[PDB]
Every structure is written in structure tokens, then in C-alpha cells.
């Protein structure tokens, strides 16, 4: 029944949106190159350029829009007539017997009528070693409509009829199928769902669900018929496993309650999270076959199936939303090279889906294409500025680069602390050393191997070697100079104060981290 919902003049809007994107990129590059100083004074070896003003304006507008969306969501209340059917879809491969039980109990004890909620769990690898998950599923839902099937096959390898009738007629269903991947189980569940439900909620085998997540998502979906998908806030079960887990939790809060909120202000959320997400069933059934059979210019994709789901939803003119009243708890890596592998995978999926997302910019707000362009072009300018200031041959240059990076991080952390109302977000300033060391080389590693474990060590080694050589060259070249001149003396009176401030900031941040974590 739903259609593409194209605009009245698709070609004109396409042309003007592409022209706007090209003009924005050209203007940003011209402002970066020109280095035109706006505000200046003496006795200060730094100024505010047009590029810096543009970045500050972008940060200000993103913060303002996120705050406005959060306030609007908080103020409004919705009926939730409780007349819509929901299907909770869980996929499992080898989930820990400790996390799957929590997930199943959370799904069972959610706050939604039992005659409107139907739970389906699909398990990969019916090799007699994965029956411990079906047994636990049966144990959790002993006194309900339970249908369990072991399918010696798959949808892309009878069983199909039994699977479909069990999923569409029963309430709690557990299907075990041959191993095909995360896409295979999700496709099997979506196809077996049919037209038996109105909304399809997607979950993982590890996510612990809040009791109000389903009802809040249904409430936000029922308000407007234009909405096709919605997400929710995702928390972390283990924020104290290591230093990486704590930073990951802070980054999760930031990316969910600032970036995603700002995107949802214009109803153009780019990605719906895996653990929390609701989709309209009719649109999903429309685009399911196309979504399954998608390749990146001749290569199958096994990454970012939630980002691709959101892209498919957006490609039909249907807007995606975000609500913070629905919460869930997931698990994040606590070890290096594993968080690094996850970040590399996410960057690969984002780069691969950027080209597909660029096709449907005309159907949504101009903020979508603006943010896509700026987020795509920011890291390259980051690297160029870093290289130039590193190899400029002055110690004050690298010191000021570090100070500027930390100042931007501190501004973001202060805004996050004010928005959340809680003070732990000041430690979000510590993500600068993680982004500048691993994430930046990982972006280029993902870009150079877009078509495709101790492998991402090499980009880290190259980046570290380049940085160390640059710092050594700058130190050598400033060691061979005469500082008796009154210009290098003002440079010295800046260097001393900057170093003192930098060390003091590092000391207070480390002390605050230890105080907040140890207690």
C-alpha cells in the first residue's frame, strides 16, 4: 500500500540539493584556504578565522537543535490507545547463557498487553550445539503459546510452511536455522512475520529492555502516519569494565542525546540503533526483498544492517524519529583492538552507505545533506591541519594545536554536562586522545579497503611514526634558533602559560576520573 512518496518536482529538488552540497563544500574549502582573520588583537598569537567561526556556528546550531528536540519530546504526551500489534524480533548466534536469559526476562516483563505483543527468536546454526538457547527460550516462556522449530535449511538454501504458520499463528516462537549470518536470521524473521503485526521491533540477544521501551516507541509511532521508523536511547551494562568502556558509555550518551536528537528534530535520523528500533510492517514488507539483495557496487555487505534498514526507510520518503523515553542496555568491548575492530567496521559501513544515502537527499530536510557533507569532509581537514601544524617547525604551533583540540573537547563536554544535568560528562573531553590516535587512522584504513585481528596495528604505527617524526623535526628546528628576539619571547610567554594550563587540566581531569571511578 505505501508508495515512494516522491516530491512533486523530483528533478528540480535533486539538482538544487546537489548544487547546495557542492557550493557548501567549495565554500568550506575556500574559507579553510583563505585564512581570513575576523577578530584580532595584539599580545595574542591566535585569532578567529572564518573556518573557526563556521565550525563554532555549526556546533552552536547542533547543540541548540538537540536541546529544542529534547525539550519538545519531554513536554509532549501521547494517548497510546493500545490497539496496535507489536512483534519483538530477536536474533542469536552464540549468546552467553548469562545475557540471553536477561534479554528474555526483560522481553517477558515488558509493559505492553500480551495479546498485542508477539515474541520471535531466530537462532543461527542448527548443529545440535545451539539447542541450549531454544531450551532456555522454552523455559522462560513455559506457560504461553510456544512454537519451537528446528529448520534443517534456510530461506536461501516443507520447512518454510511450518515456519510461517508457527510464526503467524502462535505468540512465542523459536526457530533454529542453518548458519547464514546476522542478515539471514533477520530476513527469515521478517519474511515469516507476514502481515500479522503492525509494528516490528528489532532487538539483539544481549540487549536488556526497559519496561517502557515498547510502549513509548508505539506511542511515538502512532502520533503521525508519516513516521516509518523510530529508535531509542541505548545504555551500557558494563561502564566500569575498563577505561575504554567508560569512554564508550559517555560517547554513547553523547551520540544518542545530541546528534540523534538533532537529527530527529528534522525527522531525518540517519541510523536507527540495533538494540532499540521500531519499523512499520507494511513498508518493511515492501522493501525487505530489495534490502536483502543489496551489494556495494558488486560486493555483498555483511555490515551495518541497521543503517541499511534506516536508509531503505528513508528512500521511500518516510521519516525516522528518535525518542529518549525508551531505553535499553547493551554490552561494549572493554579491550583494545576489539573496540578498534568495532570502530573500523562502523566506519566501513558508514562509508559504504554514504553513497546510497546520497541518492535520496531531495526527499528530506536540507539539514540531512548539510550534515552528511560536513561529517564526510571534517576528518580530511583535521588531518591536513594536524600535518601542517606538526611540520610547521615551531613548538608553539604543536602546543596550540593540542590546546585548540582540548578546548573544543572541553566545550563539548561542558555543554553535555549542562544538558544532562550531571557532572560526569566533563570526562568526555578525554575522547580527544582516543579519536586523534586510533579513529583517524582507522577511517583511512576503512576507506582504502572499502571492498575488503592485529591488522589495524599498521595504520596506528604509521600515524605514530609520522607524528613522532614531526614533533622531533619541530623540536630540532626550534632548538636551532635565537630566542633573544622579542617575537620568540612573546612565543615563550605563551608557551609557558599554555604548558602550565595543559598540565593543570590533565592533572585535574585524571584526579576527577580516579575519584569518580574508585568510589
Amino acid at each position, epitope marked *: 500500500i505505501p508508495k515512494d512518496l516522491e516530491p512533486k518536482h523530483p528533478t528540480l529538488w535533486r539538482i538544487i540539493y546537489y548544487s547546495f552540497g557542492v557550493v557548501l563544500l567549495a565554500t568550506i574549502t575556500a574559507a579553510y584556504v583563505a585564512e581570513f582573520q575576523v577578530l584580532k588583537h595584539e599580545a595574542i598569537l591566535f585569532s578567529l578565522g572564518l573556518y573557526g567561526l563556521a565550525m563554532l556556528l555549526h556546533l552552536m546550531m547542533q547543540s541548540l537543535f538537540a536541546f529544542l528536540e529534547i525539550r519538545r519530546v519531554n513536554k509532549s504526551e501521547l494517548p497510546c490507545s493500545f490497539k496496535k500489534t507489536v512483534a519483538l524480533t530477536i536474533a542469536g548466534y552464540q549468546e552467553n547463557p548469562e545475557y540471553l536469559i536477561k534479554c528474555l526476562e526483560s522481553c517477558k516483563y515488558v509493559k505492553y498487553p*500480551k*495479546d498485542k505483543l508477539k515474541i520471535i527468536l531466530v537462532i543461527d546454526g542448527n548443529t545440535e550445539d545451539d539447542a541450549y538457547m531454544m531450551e532456555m527460550f522454552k523455559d522462560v516462556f513455559h*506457560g504461553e*503459546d510456544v512454537g519451537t522449530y528446528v529448520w534443517k535449511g534456510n530461506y536461501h538454501t516443507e520447512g518454510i510452511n511450518m515456519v510461517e504458520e508457527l510464526v503467524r*499463528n*502462535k*505468540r512465542c516462537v523459536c526457530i533454529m536455522q542453518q548458519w547464514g549470518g546476522k542478515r539471514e536470521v533477520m530476513y527469515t524473521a521478517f519474511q515469516a512475520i507476514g*502481515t500479522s503485526v503492525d509494528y516490528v521491533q528489532v532487538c539483539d540477544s544481549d540487549t536488556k529492555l526497559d519496561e517502557l521501551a515498547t510502549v513509548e516507541m508505539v506511542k511515538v509511532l502512532e502520533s503521525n502516519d508519516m513516521y516509518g521508523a523510530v529508535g531509542g536511547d541505548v545504555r551500557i551494562l558494563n561502564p566500569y569494565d575498563s577505561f575504554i568502556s567508560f569512554m564508550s558509555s559517555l560517547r554513547y550518551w553523547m551520540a544518542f542525546n545530541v546528534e540523534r536528537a538533532c537529527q530527529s528534530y528534522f525527522d531525518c535520523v540517519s541510523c536507527i540503533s540495533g538494540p532499540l528500533g521500531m519499523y512499520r510492517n507494511n513498508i518493511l514488507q515492501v522493501f525487505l526483498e530489495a534490502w536483502y539483495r543489496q551489494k556495494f557496487l558488486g560486493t555483498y555487505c555483511t555490515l551495518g544492517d541497521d543503517r541499511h534498514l534506516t536508509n531503505r526507510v528513508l528512500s521511500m520518503g518516510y521519516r525516522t524519529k528518535y525518542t529518549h523515553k525508551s531505553r535499553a542496555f547493551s554490552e561494549t568491548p572493554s579491550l583494545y583492538l576489539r573496540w578498534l575492530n568495532q570502530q573500523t567496521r562502523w566506519t566501513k559501513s558508514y562509508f559504504r552507505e554514504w553513497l546510497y544515502n546520497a541518492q535520496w537527499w531531495h526527499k528530506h530536510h536540507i539539514w540531512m545533506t548539510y550534515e552528511s557533507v560536513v561529517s564526510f569532509i571534517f576528518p580530511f581537514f583535521i588531518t591536513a591541519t594536524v600535518i601542517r601544524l606538526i611540520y610547521a617547525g615551531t613548538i608553539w604551533n604543536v602546543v596550540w594545536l593540542l590546546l585548540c583540540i582540548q578546548i573544543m573537547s572541553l566545550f563539548k563536554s561542558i555543554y553535555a554536562c549542562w544538558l544532562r544535568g550531571n557532572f560526569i560528562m566533563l570526562l568526555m573531553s578525554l575522547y580527544s586522545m582516543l579519536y586523534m590516535t586510533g579513529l583517524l587512522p582507522s577511517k583511512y584504513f576503512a576507506l582504502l579497503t572499502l571492498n575488503k585481528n592485529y591488522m589495524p596495528i599498521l595504520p596506528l604505527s604509521i600515524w605514530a611514526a609520522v607524528l613522532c617524526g614531526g614533533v622531533g623535526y619541530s623540536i630540532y628546528m626550534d632548538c636551532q634558533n635565537d630566542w633573544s628576539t622579542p617575537e620568540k619571547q612573546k612565543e615563550m610567554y605563551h608557551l609557558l602559560y599554555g604548558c602550565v594550563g595543559y598540565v593543570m587540566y590533565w592533572v585535574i581531569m585524571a584526579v576527577m576520573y580516579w575519584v569518580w571511578v574508585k568510589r
Partner: antibody
Framework: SEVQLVESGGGLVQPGGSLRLSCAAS????????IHWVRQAPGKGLEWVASISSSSGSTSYADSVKGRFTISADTSKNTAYLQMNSLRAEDTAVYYC????????????????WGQGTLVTVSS | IQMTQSPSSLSASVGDRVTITCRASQSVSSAVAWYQQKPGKAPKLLIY???SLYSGVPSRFSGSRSGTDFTLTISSLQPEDFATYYC?????????FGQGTKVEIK
């Protein structure tokens, strides 16, 4: 434990009085299934009377039943109840009890595990 | 809403394939089920969702739908198959039963 449904409270009653039939379930929980009351007049076809969904409170009746009859379900005894007041001479039939699943769409599942019949006679 | 069974009374021998047609004016989001009942006994479920077969029912019974019409077919009529067959259009807030279609013998 095999699914069984037993009926109680049927008999003779003068017109205008009241009756309380009871449907005792065994082998399952009424909170995970629908409970329907179906009656068959002497020498006639089946007629649906009322339906109750426990843990949700959804009750449905018929045009010739609504207003007079009430349906409930007690989970402390794991039974269902049908209270018929303002009985008429036309309500004499054999009342059954049926179990079913839930309504999702074009798929329902059916009326599996029918109970026995209890006889109600409204006459002078 | 009205549910009409086409053959009110049907007679066939043993081994005869017999079909029963059932018409309902409300076929938007309501499932159609087919039940069988014998004298002095509670009805038993034969077919649900207008095509699926209940566990334990012999594979001779089958169900089909063609637009508004719903059909129940018995390929071979065994002596134990003589009973009264009923339709049911069951959705929330309204359930409607069919009537008649008593299968007899010559």
C-alpha cells in the same frame, strides 16, 4: 497435564431471574489464552455469547447478549465466569467453553480444546 | 457479517469427495475456521486460518479461499466423517458461526 475445561452452574431457572455459570480450566492458564462462551439452542446452530481476555480486560459480547450478560475471569482460581441476569425464555441452550489464542491479523488459530456442555433451561 | 453455508443438507456415499462453500460479507481482517460436531458431543476444530490443518486431523480435509468464498473439501468420505460442519468468522469484538451442512448417507 492435558488441557481440560469443565462447566458448572447449569440448571433450571424461572424467566427474569439470574444464573452464574463457571468454566474451570485445567492444564493451562487463562491469562495466556482467550476464553469464549458458545451456546447451542435445542435443535439449532452454534451461537457465540461472550469472550474474555485475562491480563488485558478485553471483553466482547453479542447484540442479543450485551447489556444483560457479563463475563469475567478469576486468576486466583484459574476459572472464568458468566453471569446472566434478566434471563429470557430464549436463552435456554447448552453452553460450551472454548479455548483459543490471540488475534494478530488474518490468522487466529481456531477454537481448540472445547469444553463439555452445561444445560440451562429458562421456563416456568 | 452474515455467514451463509451453501449446502444446507448433503448426502454422499463412502469414498466421495464433497465440497462445502461458505460466504461472508466481511473479509477484511478476520480469519475463517472450519469445525465438525457430532450428535451429543462438543465441536472439534478441523481447519484454521482458512488453509491450515489442525494437528491430528486426517489429511483428507482441506480448506481454501477464493475471494469472498471459503471452501472445505473432503477427498474421501469415511463412515466416521458424517457430522455437522460449521464455519466461523472470528475477529476481536465479533464472532459469527455458520449453520447447517449436515452430511448424511444414501
Amino acid at each position: 497435564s492435558e488441557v481440560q475445561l469443565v462447566e458448572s452452574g447449569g440448571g433450571l431457572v424461572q424467566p427474569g431471574g439470574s444464573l452464574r455459570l463457571s468454566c474451570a480450566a485445567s492444564g493451562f492458564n487463562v491469562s495466556s489464552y482467550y476464553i469464549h462462551w458458545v451456546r447451542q439452542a435445542p435443535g439449532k446452530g452454534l451461537e457465540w455469547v461472550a469472550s474474555i481476555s485475562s491480563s488485558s480486560g478485553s471483553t466482547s459480547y453479542a447484540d442479543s447478549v450485551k447489556g444483560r450478560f457479563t463475563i469475567s475471569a478469576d486468576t486466583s482460581k484459574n476459572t472464568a465466569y458468566l453471569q446472566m441476569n434478566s434471563l429470557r425464555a430464549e436463552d435456554t441452550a447448552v453452553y460450551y467453553c472454548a479455548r483459543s489464542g490471540y488475534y494478530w491479523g488474518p490468522y487466529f488459530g481456531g477454537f481448540d480444546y472445547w469444553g463439555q456442555g452445561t444445560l440451562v433451561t429458562v421456563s416456568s | 457479517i452474515q455467514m451463509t453455508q451453501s449446502p444446507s443438507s448433503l448426502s454422499a456415499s463412502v469414498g466421495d469427495r464433497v465440497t462445502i462453500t461458505c460466504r461472508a460479507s466481511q473479509s477484511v481482517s478476520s480469519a475463517v475456521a472450519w469445525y465438525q460436531q457430532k450428535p451429543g458431543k462438543a465441536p472439534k476444530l478441523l481447519i484454521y486460518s482458512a488453509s491450515s490443518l489442525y494437528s491430528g486431523v486426517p489429511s483428507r480435509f482441506s480448506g481454501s479461499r477464493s475471494g469472498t468464498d471459503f471452501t472445505l473439501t473432503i477427498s474421501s468420505l469415511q463412515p466416521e466423517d458424517f457430522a455437522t460442519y460449521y464455519c466461523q468468522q472470528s475477529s476481536s469484538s465479533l464472532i459469527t458461526f455458520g449453520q447447517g451442512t449436515k452430511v448424511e448417507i444414501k
